[PDB]
Amino acid sequence: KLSEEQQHIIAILLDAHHKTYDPTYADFRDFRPPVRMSPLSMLPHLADLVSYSIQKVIGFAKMIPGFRDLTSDDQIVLLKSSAIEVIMLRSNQSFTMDDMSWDCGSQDYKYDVTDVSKAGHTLELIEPLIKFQVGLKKLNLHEEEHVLLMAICIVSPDRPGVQDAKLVEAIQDRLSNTLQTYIRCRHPPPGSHQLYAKMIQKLADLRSLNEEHSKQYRSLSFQPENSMKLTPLVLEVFG
C-alpha cells in the first residue's frame, strides 16, 4: 500500500515541478536569439537556455523532501553533478518522437541534431543522448514517475565529494521506495513490467552521458572565445 508520507512526497514533487517547468516556454523570448544559418551559431541561444534550465533545476531541487537537511557543501556537490543529467531528463517533455527534436512551441524554439551541433557539441554525445530521449519516451512515465526520477537523480550517494553520504543515501532511499511502491499500486500492467529497473537503467545511461558531456564541455570551455559566449552561472556549475 502507498503510505500517507509517500503520497505526500509525490504531491510535493509534482507541485515543485509545475512551479519550475513552464509548458508554455514563455521565457525563451529572454534568451539571446537563436541563429540557424555559421560555426557555433546556436551556442549563445542554447547557452542561455541551459543556464535558465539550471536555475529551474535548482528551484526543483530545493523543494525535495530532505534536501534542506544536507549541508550546503553536499547540497552544492549534488547539484553540480546532477544538473546536466536532470536537464536531460526535464527535456523529455519538449522532446517529440515525431521528428526527433525538442519542440518548445515554435520553429525558433524547436531543436534538432543540427542545432545542437551548431552549439559545439559532437555527435559522440548527441546520438547517445537522442537514443536516451527515445528510450525514456518509450517508458511513457506517469508524471508522478517523472518527478520522482529527477529527484532520485539529484540525491545520489555516489556523487564524488559527498561528505555525509549516509544521509544522502537515506534521503534517496526514501524516494526510491516511494517510486517502487507507486509503480505497484498506480501503474497498471503491462506498462508496469520491469518499470523500476528500466528507470534505474536510465540513471546509469545518464552517468555516461554526463561523462561525455563533461569531456566535450572541457573542450569547448578551454577555448576562451567560446567561454565568453556562455553565461556566468553555466561557467560556475560546469566549470
Binding site: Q55, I58, G59, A61, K62, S72, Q75, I76, L79, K80, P232, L233, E236, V237
Partner: peptide
C-alpha cells in the same frame, strides 16, 4: 567557490 549556486540554494 560557488557564489551563484550557493545563493540560489539559500
Amino acid at each position: 567557490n560557488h557564489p551563484m549556486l550557493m545563493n540560489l540554494l539559500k
